[PDB]
Amino acid sequence: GPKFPRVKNWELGSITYDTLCAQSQQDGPCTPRRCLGSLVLPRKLQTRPSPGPPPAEQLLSQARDFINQYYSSIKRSGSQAHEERLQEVEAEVASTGTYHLRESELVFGAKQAWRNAPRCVGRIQWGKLQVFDARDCSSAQEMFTYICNHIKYATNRGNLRSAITVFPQRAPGRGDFRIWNSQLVRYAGYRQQDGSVRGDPANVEITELCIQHGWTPGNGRFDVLPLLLQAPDEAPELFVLPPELVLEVPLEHPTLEWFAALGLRWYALPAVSNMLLEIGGLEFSAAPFSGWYMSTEIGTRNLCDPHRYNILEDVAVCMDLDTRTTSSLWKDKAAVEINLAVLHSFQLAKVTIVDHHAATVSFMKHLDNEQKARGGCPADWAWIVPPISGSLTPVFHQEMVNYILSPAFRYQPDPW
Amino acid sequence: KFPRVKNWELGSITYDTLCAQSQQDGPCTPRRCLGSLVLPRKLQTRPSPGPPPAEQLLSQARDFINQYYSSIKRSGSQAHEERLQEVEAEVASTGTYHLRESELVFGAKQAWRNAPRCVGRIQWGKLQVFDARDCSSAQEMFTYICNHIKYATNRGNLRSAITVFPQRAPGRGDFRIWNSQLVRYAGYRQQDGSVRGDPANVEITELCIQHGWTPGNGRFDVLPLLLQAPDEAPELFVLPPELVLEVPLEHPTLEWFAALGLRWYALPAVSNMLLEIGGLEFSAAPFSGWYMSTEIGTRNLCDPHRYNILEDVAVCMDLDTRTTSSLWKDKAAVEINLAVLHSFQLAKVTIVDHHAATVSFMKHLDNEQKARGGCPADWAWIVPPISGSLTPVFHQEMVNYILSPAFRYQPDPW
Ligand code: HEM
Ligand code: HEM
Ligand SMILES: C[C@H](O)[C@H](O)[C@H]1CNc2nc(N)[nH]c(=O)c2N1
Ligand SMILES: C[C@H](O)[C@H](O)[C@H]1CNc2nc(N)[nH]c(=O)c2N1
Ligand SMILES: NC(=[NH2+])NCCC[C@H](N)C(=O)O
Ligand SMILES: NC(=[NH2+])NCCC[C@H](N)C(=O)O
Ligand SMILES: [Zn+2]
Structure with a gap:
């Protein structure tokens, strides 16, 4: 029959064919010889600190591809605005080596990246994301105000709202904008005399890093860590979050x-805050996002x-x-x-x-929606199925095809 | 080349070098992963009305025979040389060959060992292998199956066992066990399209009634066995209630x-899978554990x-x-x-x-890392259907690939 992956749901016995995976323009970790699907950080997406400017030829194709995606989303593909915007990007990449996104294009890509996230079970809400532009931000101090603004809006006193805050993209030779913390709100990990850890063992490194940077550590089991904000070509500055903002x-x-x-x-x-957001080739090293x-x-x-x-x-x-x-x-x-x-x-x-x-029930609904709008949905099974009561949820019975689509959120090396 | 595999609960790491020995391809490609799919769209075991290329069969046989002589530290010996020649000889003349009981026993245990979806492989070395290749009739199969069930059950102190019936042969119907398992409760489709009993066994339950079985009206009605001898319609056999603990x-x-x-x-006791050893195929090789x-x-x-x-x-x-x-x-x-x-x-x-169960599998991974430099495991099947992260396997990265000897899925006989 069709020449694309056949996907079955063993609960309901229904079938579908993922044709969307054909649009994937980035190889993953698997090969016909062996599957590496259960690996957390396969050395693939890993956007290593590429010093020298991206191969103009390469960045361009990635850019022309994103643009096309944008105009299609607005149903104007092939129009004059589209071709002109194309000519505009090619021009700006020919005279600078990079290029910039228009407001509405960033909002679009920001959402596509979430929409494309293979590991997020909350993608049914992908159309509802509050994108805060902050490509004007020019100081680690300014970075702290935006984040605080975000936490305030996103928290909305318990009635959480999804959002993302985009800081300046990367520039050849010039240092990146970075958030050293893995999340905007994390608990500290205190290493002991006996070798054990007090608080959250996960955040032991960043805690050690905050102290090596001036933070005066507490000693509880749930102390909210301070933030390490790194503006371009500067050592990071340490900022403490106002207790009122952290609900x-x-x-x-x-x-x-x-x-x-x-x-x-x-x-x-x-609030995941250490992932890189890639749109049309441009790389936004600091673009923390949050949901519920x-x-x-x-x-x-x-x-x-x-x-x-x-x-x-x-x-x-x-x-x-x-x-x-x-x-x-x-x-x-x-x-x-x-x-x-x-x-x-x-x-x-x-x-x-x-x-x-x-949650999982709504993701099944998201799967059925995407089957119609794009012909499939990239999903990471091991990550979509809950850590308890697996087969008791509907996703466990749904086969899934995993692949990389751009825009996207990628893992990135620690700034240190 | 060699995949780096980490355990996130302990922070340990290893390099799977065993995957290098994979001569068979899976469903994944760099473009997209298909690891969560249950059945292979193509890896199916197509009919055998015609013989397999003497070259292909010959290399899988040389490989298995090499493997067998390694396992008994008698590699390069005379017996090894003469066993390779016997195989060369039989293949060239009949387009196929046969396995020695000891080799069969070796295959079976290896097939289990190479099974990515089995979490009970720490026991792979303790497998009771029943040779039933001198089987010529459905009634004979029923006796074999009845003895396997008796031995396997052992009054509640289960013991792992596999029974191997005649291999597949060119232009000849396969010996086949129609049932998916040796024991399964019937699935009867009632009035409102609903189902009484076991919904998964609705089909097989209907094939039996179609061959003259007198169905019941219960949820847990032990289904009968429809064993089939080559190019002959299947036969109905009812399992002695005592043998069915x-x-x-x-x-x-x-x-x-x-x-x-x-x-x-x-x-x-899975009974619909196919056992493949050194190129030979056994369309009917039921196995059971606990x-x-x-x-x-x-x-x-x-x-x-x-x-x-x-x-x-x-x-x-x-x-x-x-x-x-x-x-x-x-x-x-x-x-x-x-x-x-x-x-x-x-x-x-x-x-x-x-x-x-998952704790012993972790050991097995270790024991295997030291013995072969890796262990093919399907993460989606190895992690329990509930309390997943509560077990250690949830936190263990795994590599999946196909090794031979091996158990494979095959088409339904009807
Ligand atoms: C509104 C509700 C949302 C829910 C319930 C949800 C839920 C989830 C869950 C359960 C995970 C896995 C968590 C883990 O295992 O660590 C996840 C991962 C992820 N989500 Fe969401 N999410 C939501 C909103 C967001 C937003 C707003 C974005 C992006 C704009 C997003 C992007 C992603 C990405 C990139 C990942 C993978 C990150 C990683 O690999 O650790 N999610 N999400
Ligand atoms: C000693 C006790 C054993 C235990 C506890 C054990 C446990 C398991 C479990 C939980 C599965 C997944 C089953 C499913 O969800 O369908 C499995 C799969 C499997 N086991 Fe075992 N097993 C045992 C013995 C055996 C033996 C004796 C063999 C072969 C000689 C074997 C071969 C396999 C294979 C090939 C699969 C995959 C079957 C399929 O694809 O449906 N197992 N085993
Ligand atoms: C080793 C294994 O890949 C790892 O423990 C994965 C499994 N599934 C997961 N699923 C989610 N949502 N989050 C995780 O961190 C993990 N960890
Ligand atoms: C669709 C999905 O692959 C399927 O439900 C898998 C998941 N994990 C499993 N795990 C085990 N042990 N056995 C199974 O049959 C399955 N089914
Ligand atoms: N629902 C979300 N947005 N989750 C993002 C990741 C949260 C992370 N798993 C945590 O336990 O803190
Ligand atoms: N432990 C085993 N031998 N399992 C074989 C598969 C059994 C199957 N999952 C069942 O519950 O019927
Ligand atoms: Zn894969």
Whole structure:
């Protein structure tokens, strides 16, 4: 039959063909000899610090491609405005080596990048993104105001709104704009005398980096880290976030009264801030984005991973479960309750949150929408299926095709 | 070239060099990954009415024979030389050859070892291989299958076993076991198009009734076996109720769970896959080990397209099945899985929970990294259907590729 990947949903028995993967213009990590689909950071997208200006010839084709995408999105492909905009980009790349995006083109690409994100289960909201332009920003100090502005708008007092803030793109020879922190809001990791860690083990490096840069560290298990903002060709400056802007939620269980005594808590705004946003060849090294949490992110990964807060055993001891044997599913039982606590604690604090059931269901809807609009959707199975109750959600039964489409968010090396 | 594989829970790293030995291609390409697809659009095992190119077959045979003599530290020896010549000789003359019982036993164990989707491979070295190649009739197959079931079950102390029937032969129908598993509960399509029993077995259940089986009206009705001998319509055989050990499902604390009257058989025995060793193909080579609790309690009982008993239990547990955020589903999924472990443990039948099971797989990865420099694993199948990140495999990067000997999927006989 058709000569594109055949995709099946074993739950409903339905079939589809992904023709959108044909538009992919960037190889991934797999090969016919072996699949590397479960790898987190395959050395592919890795936008290494390319010093010398991009091959004019190359950047141009990537640029003419994005432009075409833009005019098609506005249903004016082949028109005179389109061809002129094309001539305009080619011209500016011939006399400078780079080029600039128009306001509406940035908003377009910003959304396409989210839309194209293979690992994001919340893409059904892709059409609703508040893009804040900040390509005028000229200081690590200015970078701090924008971020604070963003956190204020995105948080919206518990009624979260998706957004992204785009800072200046890269310029040949000139240093990048960077946010050293992985997220705009993260908890510190304190290395100990015994070698263990206090707080979030994930953020041990950045914490060590904030201290080596002037921050006077605290000693709690949930201290909000300061921000390290790097303007072009300058050492980064350290900025502390105003406690009022950083909204948090204490965690309690709906019926296990003792859970509140655990003193666990999490912030409301998830803001990935270390990824690179690539549009038509241009590379925006600092373009933090944020939406709203999906409960398993907190209640299973952050709170239960062996290398994170790892609270599974403490909570199981409290529920008086048999932790001396795996066949009692003590881990499964506690993990469920901890997740319920996160859901319940955000609902009570009136903060936006979505569970893995509701979430995944909406992603199925997003899949069906994209099947019609683009002929498929690039999705990373291992990442779309929730860390708990996999087959209990519909995505587990949906085969998925993963590939790279541009615009896009890519991982990028740490500035240090 | 050699993939770097990391474990994010420990921060460890390794280089899979074994993937280098892959002579077969998968579904992925640099343009896009198709690793989450269940079946190969093309990797199918097309008919064998015609013989396979003497060259192709000959190289896969030389390779297997080389592998076999390595495993017994007798490489380059005389026996090795003379065994290669025997194969050269048979191939050239009949366009095929045959395996020595010892070699077959070696293949089987390797096939299991190379199976990317099997999480129980730490046991790969302990496989009871039954040679049933001197089988000429469907009635004979039934006896073999009946003995395998008896041996495999062993009163509840399951033991891994595989039975290998005649290999495939040019212009000759394949010996085939029509059923997907040796034991499976019937799926009867009732009035409102719904289904009584096991929805996955609606088709096979209909083929049996079509060949004269007297169906029942129950959810858990042990289906009969439709064994087929070359170029001959299949035969119907009913499995002796005693040989079919079954487990009644109840709950450690929830008194009413038994009420639901659920039950499940003890012997998991895939019977529709094809075993390929050194180019030879065995269209009928059933194998069995023992269940991992999640296969029954999560997929079989809770899949929406299986017994889909998730809501019932939730209601009995008096759960807020109103909204999703009450996690009524996750809650019932756990109990049902516990009930499976409890029931099997109470009936003294072998079973392994997913935590215990994935822990042994981690070891296997280690043992294999040291023995071959890697281990082909399908992450989507190795990670349990529930409590995924709660197990260690969730945090383990894996490489997937095809090695031979190997188990493959093949077309349905009808
Ligand atoms: C509004 C609700 C949204 C939800 C519920 C959602 C949810 C998710 C989840 C569950 C993940 C994986 C988290 C993890 O495993 O670490 C993810 C990853 C991602 N999301 Fe979203 N997302 C949302 C908004 C956004 C926005 C606003 C953007 C971009 C403009 C976006 C871009 C991405 C990208 C690039 C990734 C992958 C990052 C990585 O590899 O760590 N998401 N999202
Ligand atoms: C000793 C106990 C064993 C355990 C606990 C075990 C467990 C598993 C599990 C959980 C799966 C995934 C099943 C599914 O979701 O469909 C699997 C797949 C598989 N196992 Fe095992 N296994 C065992 C023994 C064996 C034996 C004896 C063989 C072969 C000689 C074998 C060959 C395979 C293969 C080829 C697959 C993939 C089957 C498919 O594609 O449907 N396993 N095993
Ligand atoms: C090793 C494995 O790829 C890794 O643990 C992946 C699996 N799936 C995931 N899925 C999501 N959403 N987030 C993750 O961090 C991961 N980690
Ligand atoms: C579509 C998806 O590939 C499919 O549902 C897979 C996922 N993981 C699985 N894992 C195991 N162990 N067994 C299966 O049958 C599956 N099915
Ligand atoms: N819903 C989101 N936008 N998530 C972004 C990633 C959040 C990250 N997994 C965390 O637990 O903090
Ligand atoms: N442990 C095994 N031998 N599993 C074989 C596959 C069993 C199949 N998943 C079932 O539940 O019927
Ligand atoms: Zn792949």
